[PDB]
Amino acid sequence: PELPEVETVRRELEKRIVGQKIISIEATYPRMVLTGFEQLKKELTGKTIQGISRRGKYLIFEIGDDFRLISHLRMEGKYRLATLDAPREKHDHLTMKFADGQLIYADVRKFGTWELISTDQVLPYFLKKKIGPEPTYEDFDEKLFREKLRKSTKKIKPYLLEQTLVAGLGNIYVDEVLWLAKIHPEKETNQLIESSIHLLHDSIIEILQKAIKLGGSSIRTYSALGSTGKMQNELQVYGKTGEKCSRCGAEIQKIKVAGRGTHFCPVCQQK
DNA sequence: CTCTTTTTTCTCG
DNA sequence: GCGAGAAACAAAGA
Ligand SMILES: Nc1ncnc2[nH]c(S)nc12
Ligand SMILES: [Zn+2]
């Protein structure tokens, strides 16, 4: 998932599991708990979920006053709220069991991670990761964004994907943002003019906030939190290779940029 | 059978 | 410090 999908999961979890006491925690893939599974099971069993927050693409469970469980879903991670008697599915790895149901984490590729850290170590954790600002008008300052772009010779798409200029863009939304802002993904950032940077800054906020409002992109929408998204119906370029651009009518092209599949309109996004 | 395709963090030169 | 490519892993399609 990208930031809008993670935010959708966050909202659903906030509505449903806040106030729930964890009865037990089980793992079939304990290796994904980077801070140690037995240690996490010992610390969190019997504790109450107080809230769910998010930073970039990271989900943060607030459990008791002193613990935070940092979860990253990476490429394919999925949570679901299931009955206590629900059968196990092939790629289910972890479960938090409550008195009236359970929260199951599944991940085909086993890339997702869990890390148990203390409340006062959350802000240093994200400082160490060098995560950039949230994509909001309040936190995403265009003036610093402009200065960072001016100083670099990096290509705009991979630089945006680094999460340092702004947090939360992944392959789908970076392609969508660059098409909306009429910028070629291989454009060197120090070549961008002030007006293009302004459009890019606002397009990042607008696309991500629209995707959040629509419940994220669910191209494969089934039996998991955040699966009822409608943003996939609003995609203009991502996965639209060979289809026509809604603005000019040229065919959308797919290329490889820094190892990622990249979808763009060659007319609207001049090299 | 092989090769390619689908977030983060590393090695290598 | 940099870019390129690989690594973690599983599965589907050409
Ligand atoms: N954390 C990242 N660093 C570099 N490139 C990236 N592409 C995506 S998606 N995430 C990252
Ligand atoms: Zn176009």
Residue numbers in the entry: 1 to 271
Article excerpt on this structure:
Only the bacterial Fpg enzymes can excise 8-oxoG, the major oxidation product of purines.
Using this method, we successfully resolved the structures of LRC with the moderately potent inhibitor 2TX (new crystal structure), high-efficiency inhibitors TX13, TX19, TX20, TX27, low-efficiency inhibitor TX15 and, TX19 in the presence of TCEP. A similar non-covalent binding at site II is also observed with TXn. The strictly conserved residues R260 of the ZnF loop and K57 of the β2-β3 loop of the N-terminal LlFpg domain are directly involved in the recognition of 2TX/TXn. The guanidinium group of the R260 side chain interacts with the unique sulfur atom of 2TX, TX15, TX20 and TX27, with the sulfur atom at the C8 position of TX19 (with or without TCEP) or with the N1 atom of the purine moiety of TX13. The epsilon amino group of the K57 side chain interacts with the sulfur atom of all 2TX/TXn compounds. Through binding at site II, the present crystal structures indicate that 2TX/TXn in their reduced forms do not disturb the local structure of the complex (the DNA backbone conformation and the side chain orientation of R260 and K57 are unchanged).
